[PDB]
Design an enzyme around this catalytic site. Structure first.
Site: not given
Lengths: 83, 83
Positions: B12, B23, B37
């Protein structure tokens, strides 16, 4: 990319690659300190049937520092063990 | 240079910082798999004084994959212990 592994069992020629690459930043040396070698033992006759094996010269890594007798210090020092 | 550390107790927006760097190749995520989550919860009012708390949207990592509930797979996987 290269990643050379060294330990206390590497000597002479196996220290030339592990030191010329490190001094040229061409590889990452991983392991422990190397066994200090790097002296040539020239054989030359003395008597009719006997000779002497005597250290004559030593070769130094691209920087200038010598292998005898400090050796190669790996960038990432890690002793062998279980994962 | 960066080197992010993650563990199964991260989620989160602990995977928004880790996921976005991974990425974009801005860091090397190291550790275990994160606790997957990712979701946004809001408290839309439905009646005079009654309301529901229903998830509507999740955040997808720069790539476009999702966090819920796969998590972040570190580039280097290790587990706690004594070196």
């Amino acid at each position: 990319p290269i990643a050379v592994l060294v330990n206390g069992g590497s000597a002479s020629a196996s220290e030339i690659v592990a030191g010329a690459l490190q001094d040229h930043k061409r590889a990452v040396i991983i392991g422990e300190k190397t066994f200090g070698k790097g002296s040539v033992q020239m054989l030359l006759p003395v008597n009719k049937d006997e000779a002497i094996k005597i250290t004559t010269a030593r070769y130094y890594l691209p920087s200038g520092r010598t292998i005898q007798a400090k050796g190669i210090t790996p960038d990432i020092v890690i002793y062998p063990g279980k994962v």
